[PDB]
C-alpha cells in the first residue's frame with residue numbers, strides 16, 4: 330500500500346494497523362524519504378461531512394502542529410488525498426499508560442515519580458504556549474521504546490480564554506471533570522491540575538477519586554471535591570493529591586509548586602525505568 334500526497338508527490342508506505350481512535354483508523358505510516366515510521370490517524374472524509382466535526386480535526390491539527398517538546402507527542406505532517414485525512418505522529422512503541430496500569434494494577438512510588446515528572450514537564454510547555462489539554466488521562470500518556478512519556482491526543486485542546494471571555498459549556502466528554510467546569514465557569518489551567526490529581530491517585534491506587542461516568546448524579550460529589558483517602562498511601566503522596574484536588578481552582582498548586590513537593594524531593598527516583606515495569610514490579614530502592 331503506497332500513499333502519495335497529491336500536493337507534493339511525497340510517497341509513504343502504510344504498515345500494520347495500530348488500533349481505533351474515534352474517527353481515526355490507525356496504521357503505521359513509513360515516510361519513504363526520511364525512512365522512518367510514524368503512527369498515523371487515517372480519517373475518511375465520509376466520517377467528517379458535518380461542519381463541526383470537520384472543524385474539530387482542523388483545530389486539532391492547527392494547535393498540535395506548532396508544539397515542539399520532549400514530552401509532547403511530536404506532530405510530523407498532515408495531508409489529504411481523495412478520500413482520507415492523514416495525521417502522522419511520534420511512534421510510541423510501548424503504547425500508553427492506560428495499558429501499563431491494566432497490566433500492573435498499581436505502581437510503586439518511584440514509578441509514579443518517574444512518570445509524573447515527565448507529565449508536568451510536557452504540561453508546563455503547553456501552559457506557557459497557552460494551550461489547555463482538557464483531556465489528561467492515563468490513556469493519553471504515550472510511552473516510547475526507551476521509556477519516555479509523551480503527552481498526546483490534542484483535540485479537546487484549546488487556547489486559554491480569560492474568565493470573562495471563556496467558553497462555559499462542557500467541552501466534549503473528558504475523563505476527569507473539574508468542580509469549576511461543573512459550575513459553568515469554563516476550563517482553566519487549574520482544571521488540568523485537577524486531572525493530574527485524578528491521574529496521580531489512579532497511578533497509586535488503580536481507581537479514580539471520583540466516578541468517571543460524567544452522569545449528572547456524579548456532579549454533586551465532585552464539587553464538593555470530597556472523597557475517601559485510603560490509609561495505604563504514604564503521608565507526602567496523600568498531601569499532594571489533596572493539594573491538586575482543592576475544591577477552589579486558585580487553591581491548587583502551580584506546576585513549579587508540584588515538582589518541588591516532598592513527594593518528589595524526599596524519595597528516590599530513577600533516571601531510567603526498565604521496560605519490565607510495563608508488566609512486572611520493580612526492585613526496592
Ligand SMILES: CC[C@@H]1C(=O)N(C)c2cnc(-n3ccnc3-c3cscn3)nc2N1C1CCCC1
Pocket residue numbers: 347348349350353355368369370402418419420421422423424425471481482
Ligand atoms: C494515532 C493516535 C495515538 C497517538 O496520538 N500517538 C502519538 C500514537 C503513537 N504511537 C502509537 N503506537 C505506536 C505503536 N503502537 C501504538 C499504540 C499506542 S496505543 C495502541 N497502539 N499509537 C498512537 N496512537 C494510538 C493509535 C490508536 C489509539 C492511539
